[PDB]
Amino acid sequence: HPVQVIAVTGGKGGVGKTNVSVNLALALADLGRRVMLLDADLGLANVDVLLGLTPKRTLADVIEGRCELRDVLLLGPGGVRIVPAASGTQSMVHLSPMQHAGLIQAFSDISDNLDVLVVDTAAGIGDSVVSFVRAAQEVLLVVCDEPTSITDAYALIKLLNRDHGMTRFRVLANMAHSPQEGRNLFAKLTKVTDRFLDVALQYVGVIPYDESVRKAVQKQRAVYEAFPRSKASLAFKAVAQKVDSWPL
Amino acid sequence: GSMHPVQVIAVTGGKGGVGKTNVSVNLALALADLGRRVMLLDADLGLANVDVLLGLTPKRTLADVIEGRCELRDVLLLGPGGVRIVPAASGTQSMVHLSPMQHAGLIQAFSDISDNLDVLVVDTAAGIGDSVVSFVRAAQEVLLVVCDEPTSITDAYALIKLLNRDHGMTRFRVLANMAHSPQEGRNLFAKLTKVTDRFLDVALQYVGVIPYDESVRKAVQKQRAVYEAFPRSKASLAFKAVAQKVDSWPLPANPRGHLEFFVERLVQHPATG
Numbered sequence A: 001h002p003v004q005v006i007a008v009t010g011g012k013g014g015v016g017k018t019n020v021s022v023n024l025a026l027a028l029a030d031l032g033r034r035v036m037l038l039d040a041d042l043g044l045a046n047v048d049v050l051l052g053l054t055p056k057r058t059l060a061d062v063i064e065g066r067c068e069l070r071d072v073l074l075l076g077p078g079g080v081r082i083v084p085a086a087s088g089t090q091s092m093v094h095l096s097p098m099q100h101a102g103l104i105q106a107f108s109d110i111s112d113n114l115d116v117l118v119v120d121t122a123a124g125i126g127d128s129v130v131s132f133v134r135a136a137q138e139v140l141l142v143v144c145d146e147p148t149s150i151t152d153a154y155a156l157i158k159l160l161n162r163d164h165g166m167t168r169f170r171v172l173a174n175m176a177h178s179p180q181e182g183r184n185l186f187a188k189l190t191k192v193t194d195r196f197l198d199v200a201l202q203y204v205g206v207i208p209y210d211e212s213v214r215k216a217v218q219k220q221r222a223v224y225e226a227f228p229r230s231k232a233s234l235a236f237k238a239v240a241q242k243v244d245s246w247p248l
Numbered sequence B: 001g002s003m004h005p006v007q008v009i010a011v012t013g014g015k016g017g018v019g020k021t022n023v024s025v026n027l028a029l030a031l032a033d034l035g036r037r038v039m040l041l042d043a044d045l046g047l048a049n050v051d052v053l054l055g056l057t058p059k060r061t062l063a064d065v066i067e068g069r070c071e072l073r074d075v076l077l078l079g080p081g082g083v084r085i086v087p088a089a090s091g092t093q094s095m096v097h098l099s100p101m102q103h104a105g106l107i108q109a110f111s112d113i114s115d116n117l118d119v120l121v122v123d124t125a126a127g128i129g130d131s132v133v134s135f136v137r138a139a140q141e142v143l144l145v146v147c148d149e150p151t152s153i154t155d156a157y158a159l160i161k162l163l164n165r166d167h168g169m170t171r172f173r174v175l176a177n178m179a180h181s182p183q184e185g186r187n188l189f190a191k192l193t194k195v196t197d198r199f200l201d202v203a204l205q206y207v208g209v210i211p212y213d214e215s216v217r218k219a220v221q222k223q224r225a226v227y228e229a230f231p232r233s234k235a236s237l238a239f240k241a242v243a244q245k246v247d248s249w250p251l252p253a254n255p256r257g258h259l260e261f262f263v264e265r266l267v268q269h270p271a272t273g
């Protein structure tokens, strides 16, 4: 039983990486999978904030040697297991390759009875982002239809490909006003990556712009839980069906 | 007389997508519209967006400067309103882990292009990484852009806490963005003040609020600044009001430097000449 590992990323700030990570995790749990969600925004933790959780200890405690990784695990909704990050601990955003590797390696000790790990990455193209993305089997790029997000997503793809040997990427359009808007967005990325790179982009669909997501964030409850019948939640179910179909 | 003070503002906020770059671009344009000589630095070093919001196509960037291929003056672009822009790179990693020395070298380089300058606006990256903290500490005024969601409040607080705890920074300016009601900006400021009052020793200063405006969405699509493309929009009028406030912050006349106890080197306000 190999664990499916999905890194949710995108370069651009605020495109919905954390919302997608949280609600994809919940949707996969709804399909019957045993799911873990790692907050890899190591110094600006938001997974706990979106879920209204107040972690006593975090990955900060782990790295500083005050506790073991198993000791910081939190229970989220639907049985999802959460690994919480720190908020405001600067050292956590520039960890050595050794510390990053050590952390990733340490997950093998809490891998029991697990089907899927979802990893929520920070904004940007920094070492923490690249380290976690490189360590995943599937790279889910969250993109929205604005020139800055398209530009940032392309930059991250180019970087991961040219410096880190990554050659396959999943693309999810978030805050789309229509499914066709997402397809057109994917078409844009396909043309520029076709022209300059040798990579395989695979489209996963859209999460629509949905006021229910804004309401869910205010409530600090996952939209998938708080508004299970909303268009966004139904779209997360669809993405989960696709993810679950991917070869391990 | 014989030292002209320069205002230096770092626009930051921790949270991704809160409007740091939109605020940087449109504050710069609004200040230029008031008659100030403005420079705008894209300090999102590895994911440049200032050029993207303005529809500029740089041939050289900060990466070329830092890596010793050209000088800072060579990469300056003339933007709307006469704002001079220093463009960043897009997808060059060797930029989101510069050494403290390399950051220092970049900051030092601005002294060569300071003539005829009133204000430098610095657009920082998301997060609390070394690049962000270095550029924030290199400025005189730190402008946190915050919106009324728990994640923005939490991230803004985290940045304030780190700067206060680790670097002794005490005073911060706060600008609310994407507000949907007239009192939302002040209410948001109060939320942040509540948390910082309880746990920190800081002095927050409320600057104002930019409303959520569909005109910003349209401007970003057109790759034109909302201040230029929709000058009568609610967002653009708010940027005008905010620039008038920013412009009123007093600068020392003829800043000639002073000594401080247990500080070896003269301490001097940013200035030119």
Ligand SMILES: Nc1ncnc2c1ncn2[C@@H]1O[C@H](COP(=O)(O)OP(=O)(O)NP(=O)(O)O)[C@@H](O)[C@H]1O
Binding pocket: A012, A013, A014, A015, A016, A017, A018, A019, A020, A041, A046, A121, A122, A123, A174, A175, A176, A207, A208, A209, A210, A211, A213, A214, A217, A232, B014, B015, B016, B017, B126, B149, B151
């Ligand atoms: N499908 C959606 N519909 C409506 N609003 C959305 C949607 N997805 C995201 N949002 C909004 O976008 C905000 C940012 O989402 P978030 O998941 O925090 O993005 P992020 O990419 O993780 N941000 P960051 O980690 O700081 O770079 C949310 O708080 C909502 O306001």
Ligand SMILES: Nc1ncnc2c1ncn2[C@@H]1O[C@H](COP(=O)(O)OP(=O)(O)NP(=O)(O)O)[C@@H](O)[C@H]1O
Binding pocket: A011, A012, A013, A014, A123, A146, A148, B015, B016, B017, B018, B019, B020, B021, B022, B023, B044, B049, B124, B125, B126, B177, B178, B179, B210, B211, B212, B213, B214, B216, B217, B220, B235
């Ligand atoms: N006042 C506003 N009204 C409406 N939309 C806005 C407003 N300000 C920002 N936006 C939207 O928010 C998006 C993000 O703005 P942007 O200025 O790129 O934020 P940022 O903090 O610089 N992101 P990043 O650098 O990637 O962390 C914009 O592209 C617009 O969609």
Ligand SMILES: [Mg+2]
Binding pocket: A017, A018, A019, A041, A046, A121, A122, A123
């Ligand atoms: Mg996030």
Ligand SMILES: [Mg+2]
Binding pocket: B020, B021, B022, B044, B049, B124, B125, B126
């Ligand atoms: Mg930006």
